C-alpha cells in the first residue's frame, strides 16, 4: 500500500541515520586542537573597477588569472583586464534580467542567462572583430541560476524548476536531465576532475550527481533554510554551503556527514557567496550586511573582515593562482583584494 | 612610459566608456514597472490595449509605451512556477508594481487578498509603491443587480458596512453597486495602512479592460512617486 511504502521508506530512512552515527568517532574541531591559529589577515583594496550602471549579479575569472567577466541588470557583460583596469569588450544582451555568467576554460566563449529561460553562448574570437551569439539553448521552464562549462562543447545549467541539464552546444539538445529536487536550484560547482558536481536547492538539501550516468549518489541535509551558494574544497572530497540562516557548513563525500558549522551570534543576515582559497585553509563568504568575511576552514574562527562595499555583496571569486580575490556588490563596483 | 600597443589599448577602452555614457542617459530617462496578477484577472487584455495604442517557454515579456514623451517599460513574468520568494529580489529598484485583481469572482477573492499581503510585507519590496487595478467592473455591476449570488455569504462584515462619506459615484449607478465596489476596495486598503510607515504607498483605481485611460492613470501615479523621492533626496523633509 501507499502508506506501507512510506513506512518502508521511513524504515529505510531510519537505516541511513544509523550508519551516520556509527562512523562518527570524533570532531574536526577536536582533531584540530593543536594546529597553530592562522592569526589575522589584512586584505586591502588594490583596484576598483567602475563602469557598470546598475546592480551586479555575476562574476567569473579566467583561467589565465588576469581576465575577468561581469554581469549587471542593465544589459551588459564587460570583460576586464585586472592588471590595467581597462575594458576589452562590452557585450549588449537581448534580455536585461541576467543572473549568471561563465567564462570558458579555453578562453573562446562566455555564457549568460537569467529570467528569459535561455542560456546564451557568445563567440569572442571571430574573423571579424565583433562578438556574436553562437547558440541559444532552450528547454528549461524556469529561470537559470548557474551555468558552468566543461569544455568548448558542453555546459551544465541549473534552473528554477527542480532540474539540471547537460547540453551539447553544436547540436543544441539535452543529453541528460537530472531530477530529484523539490525546490528551486540555486548553485552548481564542478569538481576539478570534471566528472561530478553538486547542486544546492531551496529545500535545505544538497545532492551529488554523476555526469556520465545521470543518477544521484548522495543526498546531504542539515540546514534549515534555503541554500544559496556551494563550492568544492580544492581536493574533490569536500564541499561548503551557505544559507539564509547565517551559517555555513562543510560536508565530506566519503563519510557522508557534517563536519563544521561556521556561525556567530553578532551576524543574522544570510550568505550570498562562498569560495575557498588555493590551499583550502581560508573560506570566504559574502553577506547581506554589506561586508564580506573570512573564515579559517579548520577551526571556525573569524580571521579577517573585508569591508569596503556600500551595499550587499552578491558575487565573489578567487583566481586560479591565488593572488587575488574579486567582489561585486549592488553598488555597481568590483573590488580586487590582495 | 607605455608601449605603442599598450597605448592603443587605452584608446579602445575610452571609446567604450563613451558609449556607456550614452546609455546611462537612456537608462535614467526610462521607468521600469512590473505587472502582477492571477490567471482569471484580465492582465493580458490591459497589455493588448496599451500596445495596440501608444519561443514557447519564454518567461519574461516586455512592452513599450510612452505618454507625454516619457518612456515606460512593463514586465510580465509568464512561464515561472508558483513560488515567488526568490526572483522578486531582482525587482527592488523598479518605480512601481501594478497589481491587477478581479472583482467578480467572490470565491477567489480571498486568495487575492493573501497574495497582496505577501507583496506588501516583503523584505525586499519596501520603498516600492503599488498601483492596484480593481478590474472587471462591468461584470461586477451585472451580478449584484441580478441578485443571484450574494456578497454576504463570503464576508459577513458586509451587512454592517455603509458607504463612506468620501464617495464619488459615476453618473447614474445603483447605490447597491456603489456600496459593493467600495467594500472590496476597503479590504485591500486595510492591509496597506497597517504597516506602511510612510516609506511607500498604495494607489487605488477602478478599471475595465476596454478602458483607454489606463496609460494616463499610470503616468499620473508615477509622477507622484518620483516627486516623493525627490523631496527626500533634495532634503526637504
Amino acid at each position, epitope marked *: 500500500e501507499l502508506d506501507q511504502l512510506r513506512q518502508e521508506a521511513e524504515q529505510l530512512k531510519n537505516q541511513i541515520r544509523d550508519a551516520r552515527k556509527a562512523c562518527a568517532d570524533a570532531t574536526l574541531s577536536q582533531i584540530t586542537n593543536n594546529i597553530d591559529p592562522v592569526g589575522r589577515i589584512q586584505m586591502r583594496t588594490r583596484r576598483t573597477l567602475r563602469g557598470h550602471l546598475a546592480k551586479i549579479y555575476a562574476m567569473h575569472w579566467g583561467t589565465d588569472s588576469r581576465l575577468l567577466v561581469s554581469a549587471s541588470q542593465d544589459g551588459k557583460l564587460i570583460i576586464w583586464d585586472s592588471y590595467t583596469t581597462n575594458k576589452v569588450h562590452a557585450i549588449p544582451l537581448r534580455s536585461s534580467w541576467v543572473m549568471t555568467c561563465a567564462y570558458a576554460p579555453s578562453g573562446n566563449y562566455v555564457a549568460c542567462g537569467g529570467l528569459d529561460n535561455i542560456c546564451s553562448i557568445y563567440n569572442l574570437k571571430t574573423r571579424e572583430g565583433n562578438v556574436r551569439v553562437s547558440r541559444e539553448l532552450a528547454g528549461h521552464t524556469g529561470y537559470l541560476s548557474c551555468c558552468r562549462f566543461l569544455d568548448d562543447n558542453q555546459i551544465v545549467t541549473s534552473s528554477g524548476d527542480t532540474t539540471c541539464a547537460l547540453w551539447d552546444i553544436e547540436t543544441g539538445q539535452q543529453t541528460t536531465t537530472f531530477t530529484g529536487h523539490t525546490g528551486d536550484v540555486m548553485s552548481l560547482s564542478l569538481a576539478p576532475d570534471t566528472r561530478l558536481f553538486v547542486s544546492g536547492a531551496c529545500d535545505a538539501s544538497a545532492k551529488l550527481w554523476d555526469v556520465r550516468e545521470g543518477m544521484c549518489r548522495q543526498t546531504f541535509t542539515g540546514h534549515e533554510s534555503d541554500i544559496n551558494a556551494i563550492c568544492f574544497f580544492p581536493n574533490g572530497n569536500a564541499f561548503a554551503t551557505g544559507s539564509d540562516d547565517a551559517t555555513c557548513r562543510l560536508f565530506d563525500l566519503r563519510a557522508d556527514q557534517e563536519l563544521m558549522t561556521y556561525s556567530h551570534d553578532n551576524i543574522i543576515c544570510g550568505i550570498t557567496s562562498v569560495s575557498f582559497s588555493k590551499s583550502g585553509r581560508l573560506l570566504l563568504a559574502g553577506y547581506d550586511d554589506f561586508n564580506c568575511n573570512v573564515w579559517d576552514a579548520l577551526k571556525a574562527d573569524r580571521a579577517g573582515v573585508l569591508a569596503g562595499h556600500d551595499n550587499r555583496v552578491s558575487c565573489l571569486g578567487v583566481t586560479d593562482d591565488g593572488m587575488a580575490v574579486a567582489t561585486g556588490s549592488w553598488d555597481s563596483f568590483l573590488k580586487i583584494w590582495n | 612610459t607605455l608601449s605603442a600597443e599598450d597605448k592603443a589599448a587605452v584608446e*579602445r577602452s575610452k571609446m567604450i566608456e563613451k558609449q556607456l555614457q550614452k546609455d546611462k542617459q537612456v537608462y535614467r530617462a526610462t521607468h521600469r514597472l512590473l505587472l502582477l496578477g492571477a490567471d482569471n484577472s484580465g492582465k493580458s487584455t490591459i497589455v493588448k490595449q496599451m500596445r495596440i495604442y501608444h519561443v514557447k517557454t519564454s518567461g519574461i515579456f516586455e512592452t513599450k509605451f510612452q505618454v507625454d514623451k516619457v518612456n515606460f517599460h512593463m514586465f510580465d513574468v509568464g512561464a515561472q512556477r508558483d513560488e515567488r520568494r526568490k526572483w522578486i529580489q531582482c525587482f527592488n529598484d523598479v518605480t512601481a508594481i501594478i497589481f491587477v485583481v478581479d472583482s467578480s469572482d467572490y470565491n477567489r477573492l480571498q486568495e487575492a487578498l493573501n497574495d497582496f499581503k505577501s507583496i506588501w510585507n516583503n523584505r525586499w519590496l519596501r520603498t516600492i509603491s503599488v498601483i492596484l487595478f480593481l478590474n472587471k467592473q462591468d461584470l461586477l455591476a451585472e451580478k449584484v443587480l441580478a441578485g443571484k449570488s450574494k456578497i454576504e455569504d463570503y464576508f459577513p462584515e458586509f451587512a454592517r458596512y455603509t458607504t463612506p462619506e468620501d464617495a464619488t459615484p459615476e453618473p447614474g449607478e445603483d447605490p447597491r453597486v456603489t456600496r459593493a465596489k467600495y467594500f472590496i476596495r476597503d479590504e485591500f486598503l486595510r492591509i496597506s495602512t497597517a504597516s506602511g510607515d510612510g516609506r511607500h504607498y498604495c494607489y487605488p483605481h477602478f478599471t475595465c479592460s476596454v478602458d483607454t485611460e489606463n496609460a494616463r492613470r499610470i503616468f499620473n501615479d508615477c509622477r507622484d512617486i518620483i516627486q516623493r523621492m525627490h523631496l527626500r533626496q533634495y532634503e526637504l523633509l
Partner: single-chain antibody
Amino acid sequence: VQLVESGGGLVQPGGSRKLSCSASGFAFSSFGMHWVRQAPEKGLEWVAYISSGSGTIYYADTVKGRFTISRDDPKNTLFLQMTSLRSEDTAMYYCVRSIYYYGSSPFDFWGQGTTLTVSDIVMTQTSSVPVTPGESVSISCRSSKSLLHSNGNTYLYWFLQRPGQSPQLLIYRMSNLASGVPDRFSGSGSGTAFTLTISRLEAEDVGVYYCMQHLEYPLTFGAGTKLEL
C-alpha cells in the same frame, strides 16, 4: 574578408592622386588601419596609420607634410591623399588591418595592392639560402635596440610573401603562432637576437621573409631573406 583598392596609375611629377580602399566583411569602425608600400624590387616601408575614432594619426619621416590620411566609417572606405609626388614614390601600396587589445593579433589581413608609377630602430637581416624539401631552415634578424619591454612581451613580427601574392602573417610577438598557419612554423629568441625555425619543409612556402618591429613609431622593416627551391 576582402579589401580591394584602386587609384593607381601614371602621375607626372609634382601632381596629386587619391587612393581609396573599400572594406567589406568585418567590423570596420572598430579596426585601425595602416599603409605600407613596396619598391619595384626592394622591401617594405611604412607610410601612415589612422586609429579607431580618428584620434591618432602618425606619418613616416619621408611622408610628413605631403601625405594626408582619412577614413569614412559609415561608407566603409578610407582615403589617402597624395600631394607633390616625386620619383621615390613609385611603389605598390598595400592596406593593412590592425586591432589592439589584450591578446590581439595586429597586421592580420593584407589587401591586393594598387600600382603607382611616376615619370629609428634599424633592423638588419642574410640574403638567400638553398632549399631542399625535408630540410629545416633557420632565418635570423638582429636589432639595434632591445625590443623586450618592461611589461614582459617582445614586439617582433614575422611575415611571409609568396611569389605574386600579398604578405601573410606567421608569428606575432616572437612566440605566438598566427591563426590558419601550420604548426611546423616556430619562432624564438631573446633581446636583440631572433630566429625563425621551419621543420619538415613542404612545397608552396618558398619566397621572401620579413621581420618587423613595433616597440615605438615609426615601424621599421627588414631587407628580406629569399628562399629558393
